[PDB]
Amino acid sequence: HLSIVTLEEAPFVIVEDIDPLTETCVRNTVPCRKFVKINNSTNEGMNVKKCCKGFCIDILKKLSRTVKFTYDLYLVTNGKHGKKVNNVWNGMIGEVVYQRAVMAVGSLTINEERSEVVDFSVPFVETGISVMVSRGTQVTGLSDKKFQRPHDYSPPFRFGTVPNGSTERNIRNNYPYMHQYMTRFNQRGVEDALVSLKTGKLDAFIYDAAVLNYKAGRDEGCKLVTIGSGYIFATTGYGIALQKGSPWKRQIDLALLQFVGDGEMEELETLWLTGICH
Amino acid sequence: NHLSIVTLEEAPFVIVEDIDPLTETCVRNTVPCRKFVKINNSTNEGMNVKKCCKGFCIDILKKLSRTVKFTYDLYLVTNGKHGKKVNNVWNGMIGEVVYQRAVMAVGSLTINEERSEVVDFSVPFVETGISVMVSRGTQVTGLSDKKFQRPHDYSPPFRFGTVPNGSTERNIRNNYPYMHQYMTRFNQRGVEDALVSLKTGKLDAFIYDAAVLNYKAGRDEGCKLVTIGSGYIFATTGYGIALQKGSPWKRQIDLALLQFVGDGEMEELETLWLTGICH
Ligand SMILES: CCCC[C@]1(C(=O)O)C[C@H]1[C@H](N)C(=O)O
Ligand SMILES: CCCC[C@]1(C(=O)O)C[C@H]1[C@H](N)C(=O)O
């Protein structure tokens, strides 16, 4: 009944293929589909069915047992989390804004531009802006002199983020020089940034706090250290996105508070999010 | 001289001391702040007494009125503390802004959704939430530990409480009625009282604001206290400068705070006032 959109980002949402011999998503996974175009000219395409698992998938399973709803999970195709591009929202935010999905689940950072057009769950994952450097690099945060005067260092201090998300907006809306310097170090994905950090091609990676803490926690060899931005103005959390004025915000929040109360949340946190390093 | 600003005493964010009587002056890192004290406990008759104010949020106020270039009149709230709707009327610092007795409210003021329906808030400059403090040695995973869920399963019953009428009590009473009703018998009148009961073994856990508990555990004489996050992620927020609803000054106050965070002035205040020595 309920159309729910998600986005793949480990460890919160992990996407794998279905076994063709089964027609089944098994173990801890649930069925999720994707509308994939036939080529790069039309929008013509068809659904391909996949399997989805992760921390927020397990939250969705708990939510639809407790609130007692059935759902059809699908993966966003136009954009990622959410950005206003040419005055139209893309990503998961757009799917809720334009009422193609009743809910959006995943590593969706609650911010203030987004909550002008969608209603939000209570935060269930603490997040913000964090800085990750190679183990050995010493930075106090985003206010360090390597981030404010990068040309004082040889080579110039190399740091960047993943564009079009919650982190870039917080930098672009408040510190224009920092943002303009960063875009030449735009990192396409989390995995690319960690490779350049450990190989010495990047000095610092600015990104979401929850993702960076998880990646540093179970990194092969414990080579990555994460420190808070110090941008306390950007502290927030992941939230389930609902349509503006949604009648389900009340019951979705009540179920999440139950999980936080009875320990289901902390037990989910030690299944997916705990780390080993530091 | 122009802007009336209300604050509330809570170390290390606001520390209140008396004026030197030979001078009538506030010197060093302190600024003049006044208090309206009643003459007795019968009428509302009273007079203003002048005091000196210092701390982390006082130093934020000094930077804001240098950068934005305003002069201010600092006074200490007398009816209530931070802010609560009592008999459908707001008291404390929130009430002073709601009823237009103060243009701004500065201090350990936690941003929540009930407060921001009647006042506007700066961007957060101190991240806070709900935290649990126990004696070093007590093992709790958070507020969802079964010592909190089922306190009567232990002998004696698990003794934990908070300070009433604040952000923490509202977050618990609005969502977990049994936990709140059990806590009120362990209501702590102040932070200092709760730390004494923890170190003497008369209280098992102290739920309170995260920033204050992290500071108190950081500078405890002997490092006797351990702080752990609530796990109540729904209650994560921060301290904010309270302004009247639709205030034209929220924009300029935010721009100055964002400048301090950008140029390192904030990190200089945080390691002068808030960093600790214990772990
Ligand atoms: C655009 C890919 C990465 C963007 C993210 C960021 O900018 O931090 C991670 C997203 C964040 N959780 C959000 O919801 O915008
Ligand atoms: C009135 C007792 C103080 C309780 C507080 C809390 O609830 O944690 C500390 C307050 C908090 N900073 C707020 O703004 O309410």
Side-chain angles (χ1 to χ4, degrees), chain A residues 205-218:
Chain A
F205 178 47
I206 325 296
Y207 198 66
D208 168 89
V211 170
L212 284 180
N213 290 334
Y214 165 83
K215 282 286 148 62
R218 56 184 60 195

Side-chain angles (χ1 to χ4, degrees), chain B residues 79-234:
Chain B
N79 195 288
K81 272 137 170 191
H82 289 88
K84 186 178 157 162
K85 206 171 67 172
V86 177
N87 302 135
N88 227 33
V89 310
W90 282 100
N91 57 11
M93 291 193 285
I94 296 288
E96 295 301 288
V97 170
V98 164
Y99 306 122
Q100 322 224 311
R101 291 192 273 278
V103 185
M104 290 186 355
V106 54
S108 36
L109 201 279
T110 297
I111 299 170
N112 62 39
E113 52 280 5
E114 193 204 13
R115 282 167 181 177
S116 318
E117 292 182 35
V118 298
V119 304
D120 283 349
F121 274 124
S122 78
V123 299
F125 55 88
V126 167
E127 38 180 25
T128 196
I130 295 174
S131 271
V132 189
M133 184 173 269
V134 297
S135 178
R136 188 166 241 112
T138 296
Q139 306 141 69
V140 286
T141 65
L143 279 182
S144 81
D145 194 290
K146 266 200 241 214
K147 292 177 176 166
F148 292 104
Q149 298 168 2
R150 311 174 65 75
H152 269 299
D153 284 4
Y154 304 80
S155 35
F158 201 70
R159 308 162 301 190
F160 66 102
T162 187
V163 181
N165 311 321
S167 266
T168 295
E169 177 178 52
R170 169 175 182 79
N171 259 317
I172 299 175
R173 188 215 301 142
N174 278 358
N175 301 311
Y176 307 114
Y178 165 69
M179 175 175 280
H180 164 254
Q181 295 271 320
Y182 181 82
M183 285 181 332
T184 56
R185 77 181 60 160
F186 301 107
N187 272 353
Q188 304 295 309
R189 314 170 285 151
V191 166
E192 302 300 319
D193 290 18
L195 316 159
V196 168
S197 316
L198 279 177
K199 292 177 75 157
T200 59
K202 308 300 139 49
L203 182 76
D204 299 322
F206 178 45
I207 299 147
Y208 199 71
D209 168 271
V212 169
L213 286 182
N214 286 333
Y215 170 84
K216 288 287 155 167
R219 310 177 161 198
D220 176 71
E221 202 96 89
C223 315
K224 265 31 201 312
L225 311 146
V226 176
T227 312
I228 169 65
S230 72
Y232 285 9
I233 296 181
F234 69 87

Side-chain angles (χ1 to χ4, degrees), chain A residues 7 9 80-83 92-93 106-111 114 127-129 161-169 187-190 206-209 211 237-238:
Chain A
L7 170 66
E9 166 142 65
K80 271 139 170 194
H81 292 81
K83 185 181 154 158
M92 292 195 279
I93 297 287
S107 48
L108 197 288
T109 287
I110 285 176
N111 73 41
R114 284 163 185 178
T127 202
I129 295 176
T161 184
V162 177
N164 308 321
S166 156
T167 290
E168 176 178 55
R169 165 176 186 81
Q187 283 306 120
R188 175 247 195 237
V190 169
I206 325 296
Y207 198 66
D208 168 89
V211 170
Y238 293 165

Side-chain angles (χ1 to χ4, degrees), chain B residues 7-36:
Chain B
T7 187
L8 173 65
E9 171 170 41
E10 168 143 69
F13 295 102
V14 169
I15 302 168
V16 179
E17 32 185 41
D18 309 311
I19 65 106
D20 172 89
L22 298 76
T23 48
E24 298 226 44
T25 206
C26 294
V27 298
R28 317 180 162 291
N29 54 327
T30 82
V31 299
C33 52
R34 56 171 182 82
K35 205 206 182 151
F36 185 87

Side-chain angles (χ1 to χ4, degrees), chain A residues 2-62:
Chain A
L2 301 192
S3 171
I4 303 182
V5 63
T6 184
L7 170 66
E8 170 174 45
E9 166 142 65
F12 302 103
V13 174
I14 300 163
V15 177
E16 329 168 281
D17 254 337
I18 301 190
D19 182 61
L21 308 164
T22 48
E23 318 219 16
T24 326
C25 281
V26 308
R27 298 197 132 270
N28 55 343
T29 79
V30 297
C32 54
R33 52 170 190 83
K34 212 203 143 54
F35 183 84
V36 189
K37 284 154 41 142
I38 300 145
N39 56 62
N40 302 317
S41 299
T42 72
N43 50 309
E44 217 178 353
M46 300 133 47
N47 327 317
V48 50
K49 296 232 156 143
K50 317 218 69 141
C51 293
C52 285
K53 68 173 174 187
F55 174 84
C56 304
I57 299 301
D58 274 359
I59 298 208
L60 182 53
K61 282 157 75 147
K62 290 185 175 296

Side-chain angles (χ1 to χ4, degrees), chain A residues 105-137:
Chain A
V105 178
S107 48
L108 197 288
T109 287
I110 285 176
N111 73 41
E112 91 266 340
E113 190 205 10
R114 284 163 185 178
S115 323
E116 284 334 288
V117 296
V118 301
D119 277 356
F120 267 126
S121 158
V122 298
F124 58 90
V125 166
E126 285 183 2
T127 202
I129 295 176
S130 272
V131 186
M132 183 180 270
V133 300
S134 271
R135 185 154 263 161
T137 295

